[PDB]
Design a protein around this motif. Structure first.
Motif, PDB file in Angstrom:
ATOM      1  N   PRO A 249       0.753  -1.261   0.000  1.00  0.00           N
ATOM      2  CA  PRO A 249       0.000   0.000   0.000  1.00  0.00           C
ATOM      3  C   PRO A 249       0.796   1.332   0.000  1.00  0.00           C
ATOM      4  O   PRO A 249       0.185   2.395   0.174  1.00  0.00           O
ATOM      5  CB  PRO A 249      -0.771  -0.108   1.322  1.00  0.00           C
ATOM      6  CG  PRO A 249       0.208  -0.797   2.241  1.00  0.00           C
ATOM      7  CD  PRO A 249       0.762  -1.877   1.348  1.00  0.00           C
ATOM      8  N   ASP A 250       2.116   1.299  -0.182  1.00  0.00           N
ATOM      9  CA  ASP A 250       2.933   2.528  -0.247  1.00  0.00           C
ATOM     10  C   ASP A 250       2.570   3.438  -1.451  1.00  0.00           C
ATOM     11  O   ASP A 250       2.523   4.650  -1.279  1.00  0.00           O
ATOM     12  CB  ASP A 250       4.447   2.175  -0.222  1.00  0.00           C
ATOM     13  CG  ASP A 250       5.366   3.367  -0.419  1.00  0.00           C
ATOM     14  OD1 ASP A 250       5.783   4.050   0.560  1.00  0.00           O
ATOM     15  OD2 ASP A 250       5.692   3.593  -1.603  1.00  0.00           O
ATOM     16  N   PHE A 251       2.308   2.893  -2.647  1.00  0.00           N
ATOM     17  CA  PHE A 251       2.136   3.772  -3.813  1.00  0.00           C
ATOM     18  C   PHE A 251       0.964   4.709  -3.565  1.00  0.00           C
ATOM     19  O   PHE A 251       1.115   5.928  -3.650  1.00  0.00           O
ATOM     20  CB  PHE A 251       1.960   3.053  -5.161  1.00  0.00           C
ATOM     21  CG  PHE A 251       1.768   4.018  -6.293  1.00  0.00           C
ATOM     22  CD1 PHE A 251       2.864   4.586  -6.931  1.00  0.00           C
ATOM     23  CD2 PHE A 251       0.494   4.463  -6.640  1.00  0.00           C
ATOM     24  CE1 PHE A 251       2.697   5.530  -7.941  1.00  0.00           C
ATOM     25  CE2 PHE A 251       0.316   5.418  -7.640  1.00  0.00           C
ATOM     26  CZ  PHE A 251       1.420   5.946  -8.297  1.00  0.00           C
ATOM     27  N   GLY A 253      -0.519   5.392  -0.728  1.00  0.00           N
ATOM     28  CA  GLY A 253      -0.333   6.119   0.523  1.00  0.00           C
ATOM     29  C   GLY A 253       0.334   7.457   0.368  1.00  0.00           C
ATOM     30  O   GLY A 253       0.035   8.377   1.123  1.00  0.00           O
ATOM     31  N   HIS A 254       1.263   7.557  -0.583  1.00  0.00           N
ATOM     32  CA  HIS A 254       1.940   8.831  -0.868  1.00  0.00           C
ATOM     33  C   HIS A 254       0.998   9.774  -1.579  1.00  0.00           C
ATOM     34  O   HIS A 254       1.194  10.986  -1.521  1.00  0.00           O
ATOM     35  CB  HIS A 254       3.128   8.670  -1.809  1.00  0.00           C
ATOM     36  CG  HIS A 254       4.304   7.994  -1.211  1.00  0.00           C
ATOM     37  ND1 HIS A 254       5.146   8.616  -0.326  1.00  0.00           N
ATOM     38  CD2 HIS A 254       4.822   6.772  -1.428  1.00  0.00           C
ATOM     39  CE1 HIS A 254       6.122   7.791   0.006  1.00  0.00           C
ATOM     40  NE2 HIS A 254       5.942   6.662  -0.648  1.00  0.00           N
ATOM     41  N   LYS A 255       0.052   9.203  -2.328  1.00  0.00           N
ATOM     42  CA  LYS A 255      -0.915   9.965  -3.090  1.00  0.00           C
ATOM     43  C   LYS A 255      -2.013  10.500  -2.158  1.00  0.00           C
ATOM     44  O   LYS A 255      -2.388  11.684  -2.266  1.00  0.00           O
ATOM     45  CB  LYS A 255      -1.489   9.129  -4.263  1.00  0.00           C
ATOM     46  N   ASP A 297       7.833  -3.210   5.435  1.00  0.00           N
ATOM     47  CA  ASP A 297       9.119  -2.506   5.488  1.00  0.00           C
ATOM     48  C   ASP A 297       9.026  -1.167   6.233  1.00  0.00           C
ATOM     49  O   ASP A 297      10.008  -0.727   6.809  1.00  0.00           O
ATOM     50  CB  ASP A 297       9.702  -2.313   4.082  1.00  0.00           C
ATOM     51  CG  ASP A 297       8.873  -1.404   3.215  1.00  0.00           C
ATOM     52  OD1 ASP A 297       7.633  -1.465   3.265  1.00  0.00           O
ATOM     53  OD2 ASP A 297       9.472  -0.622   2.476  1.00  0.00           O
ATOM     54  N   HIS A 298       7.850  -0.543   6.221  1.00  0.00           N
ATOM     55  CA  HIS A 298       7.557   0.626   7.053  1.00  0.00           C
ATOM     56  C   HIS A 298       6.093   1.048   6.970  1.00  0.00           C
ATOM     57  O   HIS A 298       5.327   0.475   6.226  1.00  0.00           O
ATOM     58  CB  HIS A 298       8.418   1.803   6.619  1.00  0.00           C
ATOM     59  CG  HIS A 298       8.412   2.032   5.144  1.00  0.00           C
ATOM     60  ND1 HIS A 298       7.388   2.684   4.502  1.00  0.00           N
ATOM     61  CD2 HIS A 298       9.318   1.714   4.193  1.00  0.00           C
ATOM     62  CE1 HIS A 298       7.658   2.749   3.214  1.00  0.00           C
ATOM     63  NE2 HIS A 298       8.826   2.174   3.002  1.00  0.00           N
ATOM     64  N   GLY A 299       5.727   2.042   7.779  1.00  0.00           N
ATOM     65  CA  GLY A 299       4.400   2.646   7.776  1.00  0.00           C
ATOM     66  C   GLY A 299       4.515   3.932   7.006  1.00  0.00           C
ATOM     67  O   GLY A 299       5.345   4.026   6.108  1.00  0.00           O
ATOM     68  N   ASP A 401       4.327  10.455   3.386  1.00  0.00           N
ATOM     69  CA  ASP A 401       5.712  10.076   3.151  1.00  0.00           C
ATOM     70  C   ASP A 401       6.213   9.407   4.463  1.00  0.00           C
ATOM     71  O   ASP A 401       5.460   9.226   5.441  1.00  0.00           O
ATOM     72  CB  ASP A 401       6.544  11.330   2.775  1.00  0.00           C
ATOM     73  CG  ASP A 401       7.858  11.011   2.070  1.00  0.00           C
ATOM     74  OD1 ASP A 401       8.298   9.829   2.018  1.00  0.00           O
ATOM     75  OD2 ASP A 401       8.475  11.968   1.586  1.00  0.00           O
ATOM     76  N   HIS A 402       7.486   9.044   4.468  1.00  0.00           N
ATOM     77  CA  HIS A 402       8.067   8.280   5.532  1.00  0.00           C
ATOM     78  C   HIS A 402       9.578   8.430   5.386  1.00  0.00           C
ATOM     79  O   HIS A 402      10.066   8.982   4.389  1.00  0.00           O
ATOM     80  CB  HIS A 402       7.639   6.818   5.415  1.00  0.00           C
ATOM     81  CG  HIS A 402       7.870   6.224   4.060  1.00  0.00           C
ATOM     82  ND1 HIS A 402       9.110   5.811   3.619  1.00  0.00           N
ATOM     83  CD2 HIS A 402       7.007   5.961   3.048  1.00  0.00           C
ATOM     84  CE1 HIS A 402       9.005   5.345   2.385  1.00  0.00           C
ATOM     85  NE2 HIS A 402       7.739   5.425   2.017  1.00  0.00           N
ATOM     86  N   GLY A 403      10.299   7.896   6.365  1.00  0.00           N
ATOM     87  CA  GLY A 403      11.749   8.076   6.489  1.00  0.00           C
ATOM     88  C   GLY A 403      12.142   8.572   7.858  1.00  0.00           C
ATOM     89  O   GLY A 403      13.304   8.585   8.173  1.00  0.00           O
TER      90      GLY A 403
HETATM   91 ZN   LIG Z   1       7.550   5.227  -0.299  1.00  0.00          ZN
END
Ligand SMILES: [Zn+2]
Ligand SMILES: CCn1cc(-n2c(C3CC3)c(Sc3cccc(C(=O)O)c3F)c3ccc(Cl)c(F)c32)cn1
Ligand SMILES: CC(=O)N[C@@H]1[C@@H](O)[C@H](O)[C@@H](CO)O[C@H]1O
Ligand SMILES: [Ca+2]
Ligand SMILES: [Zn+2]
Length: 751
Positions: A249-251, A253-255, A297-299, A401-403
């Motif tokens: 679900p990352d793609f 999620g950024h949107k 790999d992350h939230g 975003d994340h990081g």
């Molecule tokens: Zn990402």
């Protein structure tokens, strides 16, 4: 050549990665990527003749061939979906003949926030079953930086990103004089990729991995059909580990942000793919034969274009620098030998300029230690931590975003183990992703390559372990000096109450003395001229003289501190907590003294005077173990003598880079810390021993408005302190060793 009879083979190319190298045969697509009539069987297709154009089949012959559509059995032979079926315990791997081991399928999802599970059975009935029926954790901690490439290789290698070398989605390697990017060909060069990833750890040990990586461009249905195809291969070709990766679900999620209403659908779609996998495994009789790990790999946090700090507002010569932007900052000199690049001047001008500032500059050595994010040539000296929800950019279309810092709730992610070797309906505490290589190695009978997990810290995830942990051997045994010298020889200028869980094991070669007193116990290093640990127990309702057990040769001296213009001293056992005034003089022994910068003493003293008393009322007593930490090379490992770069001006008194405490009480706080029968509760930190308080923008105010915050930011695992000291703690308790490891991997975030 042609891929005729060769699709998704295991070695012109016709394997799963061939697209990536622009090398798949002319008829790869035609034969290998077949899309006709979709992915589900439907009533009209039961009893058909095989047709070669189809995407998957609904004829009787498909079951052997391996390639029925994953719901053929549902639609045509009456059978139920896996999801529809009751939770049944798997007390033994029900596998076919010649399956040596329960095969393993790692199912990666990108940007899968642990909160997404709250959503639950409406949105993801399949995943929910895996959680409900297997072994899960409320959430799993990733690593920093909470980005995809660093986090996926950590699952694969068990190593911190500074160790395996994939330190970021993008990096500059000053030795290679080249750069690594998510999008690009540079990443394909293996030279960037250290450690021993799970696919290599298996190959070398004879356990077959297959072609392990898929080309992203191949759709998720074709991937899971091919996986099922390979699991009907004869025993000499069949792999025993498999991996699947969803960029969702990352793609999305950024949107749309993590709490977007538009997230409902991409997650149901994913659950579509998970159900197909269990449906597919159930129709090959494999659904009670395979271990499946659902893992992220992350939230994902909420982040919009207008929450963006600009360096050009803080710095004057900004065209001189290079900035890796986003939810973190890394800064280096743009131009080669530009003497008008001054890193001291950059850090200084970024420090606390603005009241509202949404980042903080660090020299990587000064980042909290829990992040283990310094020891690599591709981590530039200057790092900016960014506040959750914010972005840093260089000069002046997305919602998440994340990081960020990996202690952050929105950056947490999921884990579900389910299969023959995983527990049944078992909820377990949070853990860190670095512990998953070893477990994954336990599930394939593999000896794990050297890593950063703590092997045995996770054995409560499984119904049976091929690994029993054992304590490490004590390298140097202690001296117990009696009274030996006189106060004329000096030119200066318990175990029932204070050492509750046994002494720490010194795991390197040196000489040291245990020293007893009324209020505390200590192990005292002759090499380093101070204690390596001081243990003591505050109950709920609670001048420097020579030590006559220790040689003048092996003691410190006040004179040294008069020479040093910058250095002062503090005490490990806090005088402020002595039981009587007779006893208070014990606290001022030269053997409890340690070199502290004034700016540090404010933090130390506040901790000792106010917080320990506090935490001892709150938790019904505490046992503190404090000492120094030398890590001049910032590898996260205790230092050898030849690495210490600072001594107290004039002397052989080495200067610590950090000081630690380990704070422990009964988890059952109806029992005091000293009268405790069941499990422990622990909390911990490592504070950087810096000569300024430039980290704490509020340092100007009274210590109650900023110290305890500084400490919380430098929360740490007991294990981190073990790496940094080469000590080993909790060696004599009423608890089983693997539970102690779990205790020792615990990080108390404050969220
Ligand atoms: Zn990402
Ligand atoms: C040296 C050990 N190693 C590392 C990888 N590895 C690669 C290949 C080298 C680029 C990628 S990137 C990628 C993969 C698959 C397909 C494509 C594609 O462009 O279509 C792609 F870009 C990667 C990602 C995560 C992890 Cl944990 C790895 F181990 C990854 C393969 N082996
Ligand atoms: C902080 C720490 O211990 N990091 C270790 C590193 O020193 C070691 O080289 C690697 C392989 O064991 O795993 C990691
Ligand atoms: Ca070191
Ligand atoms: Zn990701």
């Amino acid at each position: 050549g042609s891929c005729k009879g060769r699709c998704f083979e295991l070695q012109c190319r016709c394997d799963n990665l061939c697209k990536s190298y622009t090398s798949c045969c002319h008829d790869f697509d035609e034969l290998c990527l077949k899309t006709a009539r979709g992915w589900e069987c439907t009533k009209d297709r039961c009893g058909e003749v095989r047709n070669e154009e189809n995407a998957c089949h609904c004829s009787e012959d498909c079951l052997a061939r391996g390639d029925c559509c994953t719901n053929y059995q549902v639609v045509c032979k009456g059978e139920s979906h896996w999801v529809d079926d009751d939770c049944e315990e798997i007390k033994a791997a029900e596998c076919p003949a010649g399956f040596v081991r329960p095969p393993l399928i790692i199912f990666s999802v990108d940007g899968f926030r642990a909160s997404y599970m709250k959503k639950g059975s409406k949105v993801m009935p399949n995943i929910e079953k895996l959680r409900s029926c297997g072994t899960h954790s409320p959430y799993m901690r990733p690593v920093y930086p909470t980005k995809t490439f660093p986090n996926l290789y950590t699952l694969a290698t068990g190593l911190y990103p500074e160790s395996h070398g994939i330190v970021g989605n993008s990096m500059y390697d000053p030795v290679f004089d080249a750069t690594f990017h998510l999008r690009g060909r540079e990443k394909f060069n293996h030279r960037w990729w250290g450690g021993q990833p799970l696919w290599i750890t298996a190959t070398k040990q004879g356990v077959k991995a297959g072609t392990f990586f898929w080309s992203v461009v191949i759709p998720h249905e074709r991937r899971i059909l091919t996986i099922l195809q390979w699991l009907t291969l004869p025993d000499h070709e069949r792999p025993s580990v498999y991996a699947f990766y969803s960029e969702q679900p990352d793609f999305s999620g950024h949107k749309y942000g993590p709490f977007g209403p538009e997230m409902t659908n991409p997650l149901r779609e994913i659950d579509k793919i998970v159900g197909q996998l269990m449906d597919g495994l159930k129709q090959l009789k494999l659904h009670r034969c395979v271990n499946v790990i659902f893992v992220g790999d992350h939230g994902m946090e909420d982040v919009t274009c207008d929450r963006t700090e600009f360096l050009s507002n803080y710095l004057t010569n900004v065209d001189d620098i290079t900035l890796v932007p986003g939810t973190l900052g890394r800064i280096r000199s743009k131009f080669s030998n530009n003497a008008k690049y001054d890193p001291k001047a950059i850090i200084a001008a970024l420090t606390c300029k603005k009241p509202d500032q949404h980042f903080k500059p660090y020299l990587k050595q000064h980042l909290p230690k829990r992040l283990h994010y310094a020891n690599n040539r591709r981590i530039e000296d200057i790092h900016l931590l960014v506040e959750r929800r914010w972005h840093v950019a260089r000069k002046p279309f997305f919602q998440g975003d994340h990081g960020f810092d990996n202690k952050v709730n929105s950056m947490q992610t999921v884990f579900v183990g389910y299969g023959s070797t995983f527990k049944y309906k078992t909820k377990v505490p949070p853990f860190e992703n670095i512990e998953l290589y070893n477990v994954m190695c336990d599930l394939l009978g593999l000896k794990p390559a050297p890593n950063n997990g703590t092997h045995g810290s996770l054995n409560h995830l499984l119904r049976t372990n091929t690994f029993r942990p054992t304590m490490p051997e004590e390298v140097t045994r202690p001296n117990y000096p009696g009274i030996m010298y006189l106060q004329s020889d000096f030119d200066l200028g318990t175990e029932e109450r204070h050492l509750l869980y046994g002494r720490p094991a010194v795991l390197y070669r040196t000489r040291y003395d245990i020293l007893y007193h009324t209020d505390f116990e200590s192990g005292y290093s002759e090499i380093f001229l101070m204690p390596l640990w001081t243990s003591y127990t505050v109950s709920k309702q609670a001048c420097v003289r020579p030590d006559v057990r220790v040689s003048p040769s092996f003691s410190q001296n006040c004179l040294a501190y008069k020479n040093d213009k910058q250095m002062s001293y503090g005490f490990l056992f806090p005088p402020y907590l002595s039981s009587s005034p007779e006893a208070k003089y014990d606290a001022f022994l030269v053997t409890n003294m340690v070199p502290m910068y004034p700016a540090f003493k404010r933090v130390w003293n506040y901790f000792q005077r106010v917080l320990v008393k506090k935490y001892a009322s709150e938790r019904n007593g505490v046992n503190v173990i404090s000492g120094p930490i030398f890590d001049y090379d910032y590898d996260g490992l205790h230092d050898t003598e030849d690495k210490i770069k600072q001594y107290v001006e004039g002397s052989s008194i080495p200067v610590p880079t950090h000081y630690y405490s380990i704070i422990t009480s009964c988890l059952d706080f109806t029992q005091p810390a000293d009268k405790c029968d069941g499990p422990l509760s622990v909390s911990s930190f490592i504070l950087p021993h810096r000569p300024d308080n430039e980290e704490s923008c509020n340092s100007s105010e009274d210590e109650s408005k900023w110290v305890e915050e500084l400490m919380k930011m430098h929360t740490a695992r007991v294990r981190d302190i073990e790496h940094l000291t080469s000590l080993d703690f909790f060696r004599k308790t009423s608890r089983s060793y693997p539970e102690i490891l779990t205790l020792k991997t615990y990080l108390h975030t404050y969220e």
